[PDB]
Design an enzyme around this catalytic site. Structure first.
Site, mmCIF file in Angstrom:
data_model
loop_
_atom_site.group_PDB
_atom_site.id
_atom_site.type_symbol
_atom_site.label_atom_id
_atom_site.label_comp_id
_atom_site.label_asym_id
_atom_site.label_seq_id
_atom_site.Cartn_x
_atom_site.Cartn_y
_atom_site.Cartn_z
ATOM 1 N N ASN A 1 -4.635 8.128 6.745
ATOM 2 C CA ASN A 1 -3.384 7.425 7.014
ATOM 3 C C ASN A 1 -2.708 6.848 5.802
ATOM 4 O OD1 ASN A 1 -5.885 5.785 7.997
ATOM 5 N ND2 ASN A 1 -4.493 4.208 7.242
ATOM 6 N N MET B 1 15.028 -9.751 -3.866
ATOM 7 C CA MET B 1 14.788 -9.927 -2.448
ATOM 8 C C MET B 1 15.692 -9.063 -1.574
ATOM 9 S SD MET B 1 12.763 -11.938 -0.728
ATOM 10 C CE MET B 1 12.452 -13.259 -1.873
ATOM 11 N N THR C 1 -5.353 -2.128 9.098
ATOM 12 C CA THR C 1 -4.176 -2.178 8.247
ATOM 13 C C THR C 1 -3.868 -3.546 7.702
ATOM 14 O OG1 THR C 1 -2.740 -2.406 10.179
ATOM 15 C CG2 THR C 1 -3.237 -0.190 9.463
ATOM 16 N N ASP D 1 10.093 -5.197 -6.317
ATOM 17 C CA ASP D 1 9.313 -5.942 -5.351
ATOM 18 C C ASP D 1 9.730 -7.371 -5.649
ATOM 19 O OD1 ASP D 1 6.784 -7.527 -4.198
ATOM 20 O OD2 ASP D 1 6.745 -5.574 -3.368
ATOM 21 N N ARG E 1 0.812 -1.210 0.000
ATOM 22 C CA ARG E 1 0.000 0.000 0.000
ATOM 23 C C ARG E 1 0.845 1.260 0.000
ATOM 24 N NH1 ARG E 1 -4.551 -0.349 -1.692
ATOM 25 N NH2 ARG E 1 -5.470 1.469 -0.583
ATOM 26 N N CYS F 1 2.573 7.648 9.597
ATOM 27 C CA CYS F 1 1.444 8.502 9.341
ATOM 28 C C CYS F 1 0.883 9.067 10.623
ATOM 29 C CB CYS F 1 0.401 7.713 8.575
ATOM 30 S SG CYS F 1 -0.334 6.347 9.505
ATOM 31 N N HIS G 1 -7.950 4.156 14.787
ATOM 32 C CA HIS G 1 -7.222 3.852 13.588
ATOM 33 C C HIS G 1 -7.927 2.858 12.686
ATOM 34 C CE1 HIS G 1 -3.710 3.057 11.166
ATOM 35 N NE2 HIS G 1 -3.044 3.874 11.948
#
EC number: 1.2.1.12
Lengths: 333, 333, 333, 333
Positions: free
Chosen positions: D312, D76, D178, D31, D10, D148, D175
């Site tokens: 956030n 990696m 996540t 990635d 994200r 954040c 919050h």
């Protein structure tokens, strides 16, 4: 009944609740990842099904549930679990990965007698309680209890086919979220739709459930198929079966046939209701399938849509214990 | 355009947003219950579709949106709204209460030229943009824009019937929550399932959508019917249509027929995708129906399930403006 | 105990579950809006708390729950409910509108002896079980059981103030959604934030809870105030109290003082846990407040943040029966 | 700009969106787990922030976003990413794993000039845009953009401390869920509450945010601490700050001080509103902290609670780009 459980995930852990609830005896649990103080917490608290009413404690390296001492093992490879040491004979294999006969057979090296895969198997005979248990013979070493949607679909399809003949049918299950989903959009390489945020989304998904009914009821092979929509509810799902029937009938003949089977051959597997029920009313329900009389619709004398609820966690847990009991009785007769 | 809106609920507010998005002109809004300074707030902030981009203020008893002045009335009864005072001629009747021709005609007492019910009507001719707009004639003083699920079903039913002939179809819509539902279990006298906690539950429900398609495409009359499951998502819904077809075909023939129609006669109404989409991918989508190619399944050459998405709040609001623009063209032709 | 309940909404209906669960006797229910066949359904099925385990039927115009025949009335105005006819003496007034002594007093015209307002009253003496029940004297005709957040805040504030003195404190409750909220953005003229979609949003809201603790514990008057955030959970809320203490202390002195009071004077009102609990673990909990030992934090010897869970529906229902029992004992001594 | 991104979770994806929104230039992404055609899909579709407007395709082993080619690596280990090969100089390290200076330095083995950890660091200097950017000097090779919640707390703590002096403060953030949470109850070894069903539950949790503010504003070091409650919303969070102040003041003085700072030294970082907002009103908001004037309460002239919102996911992504643009200016000055 000398039951051992491999996997302390959601199914393993609720198969244990079911056993306790049903007077069954689990003597060992294996999990490589959860340590015994974490097993106690996970067994004790459950967000969907409530706190276990009973004493759950770790005592001398064993999980002790209401006096019942359960040996715990933490083996990574099934072949190395010493099942014989606890006296575990029939083991519920719930990890989701040792699902074929070859792989599940790795439990025999530790002294297991029979293995019950609690998932669809590609090759071990699949059973649904109330539909094909008479096919079980004591020489079967590895069996499967199929999936929770097959345990909901197969009851209702057995009644429809016995009385009016299913020419063909297409199913949709509106399914509660599962552990393989993601709180927010994340990777899920094998199913891109399945990585999208579970609480935010209606997510199309596949299901082999209708396919597998062709194996449990051989006469329906190739006549049913379907799909799933995952929606943001924590548990309890609903099968929506649209079927073309061979014999003309009314919706009241379909309601009468379902009530009759819930009262006799499918008592305790197939339930029947005519109330204004919604999914939370079946949290904790022990039945495999609960036909909803007022929700289904008939367009014509041979084309109809039937609706059946299932608590996808709980009914299937209870059926794993029912299949073990049936098996034991057949293996000692 | 001289549009007037009656009601400032979700449909009324989003038809005002759509008008402004599309350059159409709204000159007056009526709501008995929502005061002008609360209208500013409800129009500006929107949990699902976001904050309005542009200035929204109350100025001298008018709602001013980007410099455009909108006269506001707070009349309970249609016959009492002074539509001619504000120069309002085409009224979007969105309260859900005045839906028959006899009840919607009360708007003519105030000076309206035409009334568009933004809901199904028992008797006002119903239109779905892209399917039967050519039936509109300038003498029709009260018309209906049907519902958001009919606007999703009818385009897909039109291509399927044109190309392969629908013999029989049963529809389920998995539907986002609506304003008539309840945050926690409470009273809903007419529809007991509909009063149960909306975020907790999958809720069986009725839909007239499928029946209404037989009004819009007269040859599908009596060939279709269906139901709804309300699920905990704030917006965007999906039609799950199971159909027996007259002509044998492959699923690739259905895909090709949909793709072609979305490029041509249904451009803007029917969309086509082959991506791994989920419902949040259609929030704010302007189209009436987006065929999800990858989600449908075909059992046999004549029995298939088709999945089509729709943003039940937003595509419908845009179609109300498209219906009014078609009508103003024919009326001044 | 000759209890009558006015209102069959969420509190009335769970006060009845609580009474049954506690051996209490309800002899009459009044509601103008729910008819007896709807009362049976609403009492029987509950999405948060489960299906009533017991027989619930309508029989001769009475609601019959496990043999207990409960007379039902459907009066709009409290003055006209014939409480004397069923022998209802102490009536739980749960409608939310007859909350002052003058208004609640309308129950005396039908023969009620005492009225228990299950909401904050602007003038009837407010009681919290375990904190000020000794203030109750048999001459009090109308009392109030305060709110579910006051029943959670006041325990925990009594212990903190008795042992370390509260100089001042500010509270936030993270509160589950309620019946006054909206499934999607809708009108709520008296609280604009409160009409926004409940399942989509964290919503700031007010609460008189900390104010009311100044009335239940007179020494804390004017020293506490707070607010609420409504979040998308169906039930169970949490008080987050940040407090400046008069005497220096450690967090372990605060844990020790809370455990001591949960074991003695506040046994059954104030619970104590040191587990890794989340809100679903308290669904169905009967206690008023459950102090969470591991979640609180201490910045300094006099500045700390304390966390206490409450099942905002269930604990408060059980306390209404506890206040009636205390009252009856005091009125017949 | 020559930005490289490590990780396509994200934060990584939304920092790519922010760069493109802001005209900044990203030349490579790494990635190990997400393949190029899955990157196209994850970047294009987003349940919370919507579909990317613009073309996104995979072309010759590169990700092409609006004509810009982005070289993709799937390494990696940081030391193995060929950053110099793609001309990548300022690396946003967003995996959450390489957060110390020793671990983030592995990027220099591949040719990186600077590394920006988009997470707190135990030792890399932490920046909050608007509070301490002037401490940045061009010799700092590894910096952190803090978290954040620190980016929401620190602006508000800065105005409060400057004008009234914070003696002591305790913070709660309510919050959104996540990526580390779970759809249903499951294993979370380090943090047992964090494995419980995320859509079902209010979940107590830790936050280092408040401690980290003492790093960013050295005079608040040790004066602040706090906790988090994770609640079932997909994005946007709120800080609830309870503070004892050095100087006596009215709430109107706090409002005036915040309003002034958002017009001047904190323009773009701190926002100010006096509307009846809810969390969905801040989805896509670019600011780090929006002070909600109407939600705070003041008990005494020195004890007050302040509420500030933040998206956030999104404000933080934009701040990473603002930190890199500040750094490139100082480095080429």
């Amino acid at each position: 009944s000398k039951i051992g459980i491999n996997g302390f995930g959601r199914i393993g852990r609720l198969v244990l609740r079911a056993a306790l609830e049903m007077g069954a005896q689990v003597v060992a649990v294996n999990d490589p990842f959860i340590a015994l103080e974490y097993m106690v917490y996970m067994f004790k608290y459950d967000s969907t099904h409530g706190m276990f009413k009973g004493e759950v404690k770790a005592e001398d390296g064993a999980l002790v549930v209401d006096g019942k001492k359960i040996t715990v093992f933490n083996e990574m490879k099934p072949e190395n679990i010493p099942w014989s040491k606890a006296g575990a004979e029939y083991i519920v294999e719930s990890t989701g990965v040792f699902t074929t006969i070859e792989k599940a057979s790795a439990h025999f090296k530790g002294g297991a007698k029979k293995v019950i895969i609690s998932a669809p198997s590609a090759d071990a005979p699949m059973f649904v309680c109330g539909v094909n248990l008479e096919k079980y013979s004591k020489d079967m070493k590895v069996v499967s209890n199929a999936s929770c949607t097959t345990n909901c679909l197969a009851p209702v399809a057995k009644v429809l086919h016995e009385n009016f003949e299913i020419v063909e049918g297409l199913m949709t299950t509106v399914h509660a979220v599962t552990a393989t989903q993601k709180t927010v959009d994340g990777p899920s390489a094998k199913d891109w739709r399945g990585g999208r945020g579970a609480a935010q989304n209606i997510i199309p998904s596949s299901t082999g459930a209708a396919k597998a009914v062709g194996k449990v009821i051989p006469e329906l092979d190739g006549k049913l198929t379907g799909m799933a929509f995952r929606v943001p509810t924590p548990n309890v799902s609903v099968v929506d079966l649209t079927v073309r029937l061979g014999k003309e009938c009314s919706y009241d003949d379909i309601k009468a046939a379902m009530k009759a089977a819930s009262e006799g051959p499918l008592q305790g597997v197939l339930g029947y209701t005519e109330d204004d029920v919604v999914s939370c009313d079946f949290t904790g329900d022990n039945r495999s399938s609960i036909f909803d009389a007022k929700a289904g619709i008939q367009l014509s004398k041979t084309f109809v849509k039937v609706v059946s609820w299932y608590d996808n966690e709980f009914g299937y847990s209870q059926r794993v214990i029912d299949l073990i009991k049936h098996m034991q009785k057949v293996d000692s007769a």
